[PDB]
Amino acid sequence: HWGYGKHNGPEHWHKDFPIAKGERQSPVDIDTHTAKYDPSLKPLSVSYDQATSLRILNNGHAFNVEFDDSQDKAVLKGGPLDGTYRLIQFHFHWGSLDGQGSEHTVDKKKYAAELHLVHWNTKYGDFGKAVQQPDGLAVLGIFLKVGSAKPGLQKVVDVLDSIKTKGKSADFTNFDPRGLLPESLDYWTYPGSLTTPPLLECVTWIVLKEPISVSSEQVLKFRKLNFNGEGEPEELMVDNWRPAQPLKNRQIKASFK
Secondary structure, three states: OOOOOOOOOHHHHHHOOHHHHOOOOOOOEEOOOOOEEOOOOOOEEEEOOOOOEEEEEEOOOOEEEEEOOOOOOOEEEEOOOOOOEEEEEEEEEEOOOOOOOOOOEEOOEOOOEEEEEEEEEHHHOOHHHHOOOOOOEEEEEEEEEEOOOOHHHHHHHHHHHHHOOOOOEEEOOOOOHHHHOOOOOOEEEEEEOOOOOOOOOOEEEEEEOOOEEEOHHHHHHHOOOEOOOOOOOOOEOOOOOOOOOOOOOOOOEEOOO
């Protein structure tokens, strides 16, 4: 029964998921004055030309755009990563107000939302095995600010009415995630965790420095989703973000000067 509400929010998660107080929890604040350039980081390689989206699902805490991950169709390599990581899904976190919504922060700045493109290390064969490994996942995180619309997001926005409530899914084929990327692939990276229960410490985070812009209208449509199932009391799906967790014995590295 975890969530983002008054009585079940992030500050309660530790009771059912004790790793919430672990050594490598995410998100974190990215301090641009202490993150150090690492010249031995490589450019990231984002290879999404063959991506096959299938479906969009409201899971009661966000919505996931799901991909066919049964072949190397959409993969992330390079950067800090060794080997090949396959795209499985993306989802967002967002706020009730434009001054909040992101999970990572930059010098304590909160963005309006954050996109997570989740990839698993093919050496482990499937997602469920991957999340049990320290290097099982690579999550590409991208900040969203409100300004000009992002054309490449509109097809996502378009479909939200069809998945208003928890447990609803809709076919969502032929969506191109390249339309969600900023111009630059400059990034910060650090070891951490999933940001929802089970909070497993299996993630190499790759957080892009450049945000994407989305429009007010686009964000407003995200805020019409519901946490609840159909025929239950409406509770708007907003503020579905975990706050920054202690960095502990970690360093954030930058791919850029």
